[PDB]
């Protein structure tokens, strides 16, 4: 709560305090606010890694629908997780939502074989 209030009182020019807040919020297992901070700073790659690492798949999917460039970063880990659960129909849909259409085809060809 205090790191949030500080990060909200800090200016957008204060990168070193803001990145120290975001890294402490990650270290303190507070990914929704580390996410708000990475979003305020515009570092979308660290944000999607944060949501995939903290396994917040719903927040990840919502970010990937807003920023199509991260569909691969979210659905590759999730589609691998579906394929490892033998949920290959759902995994094939997940690889497709990732933009990984060639792998969505190759997995189904491999299952057909």
């Amino acid at each position: 709560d205090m790191l949030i209030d500080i990060a909200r009182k800090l200016d957008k020019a204060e990168r070193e305090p803001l990145l120290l807040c975001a890294t402490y919020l990650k270290k303190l297992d507070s990914p929704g606010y580390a996410a708000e901070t990475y979003l305020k700073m515009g570092d979308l790659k660290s944000l999607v890694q944060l949501h995939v690492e903290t396994q917040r798949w719903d927040e990840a999917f919502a970010l990937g629908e807003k920023h199509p460039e991260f569909k691969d970063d979210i659905y590759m880990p999730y589609a691998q997780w579906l394929a490892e659960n033998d949920r290959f129909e759902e995994a094939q849909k997940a690889f497709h939502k990732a933009g990984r259409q060639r792998e969505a085809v190759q997995v189904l060809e491999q299952l057909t074989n």
Binding site: A83, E84, V107, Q110, L111
Partner: protein
């Protein structure tokens, strides 16, 4: 082996291990790096165990490949008592349906009904 490892081609390395008869290594590579072939590798290994006349271990690996529903009855079709023991041990619905169809063709309708009732196959 070193070349296939250097390529990161765990699929060709798994086929290689199978062809070399090194099934344990093949299963380890399938379990860690080639999870999509793992059912197929268990099925092929079960086929080689069946060919090697080790039916008990073949059963365990057909079960792991989830192909026991059609491969086990094929393999034990010559030894009916063992198949009956197996069907009674797994308590699987699909297997009780198959065993009831076998009893139905042999005319043992009272036993077929008993196993269709166990299988919940009201039809």
């Amino acid at each position: 082996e070193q070349l296939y490892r250097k390529c990161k081609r765990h699929d060709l390395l798994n086929k290689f291990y199978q062809a070399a008869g090194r099934w344990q290594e093949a299963l380890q590579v399938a379990e860690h790096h080639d999870r999509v072939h793992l059912r197929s590798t268990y099925h092929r290994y079960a086929g080689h165990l069946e060919a090697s006349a080790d039916c008990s271990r073949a059963l365990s690996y057909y079960e792991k490949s989830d192909t026991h529903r059609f491969e086990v009855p094929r393999m034990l079709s010559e030894d009916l008592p063992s198949l009956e023991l197996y069907v009674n041990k797994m308590k699987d619905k699909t297997l009780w349906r198959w065993w009831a169809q076998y009893l139905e063709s042999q005319g043992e309708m009272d036993a077929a009904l008993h196993y269709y009732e166990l299988a919940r196959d009201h039809f």
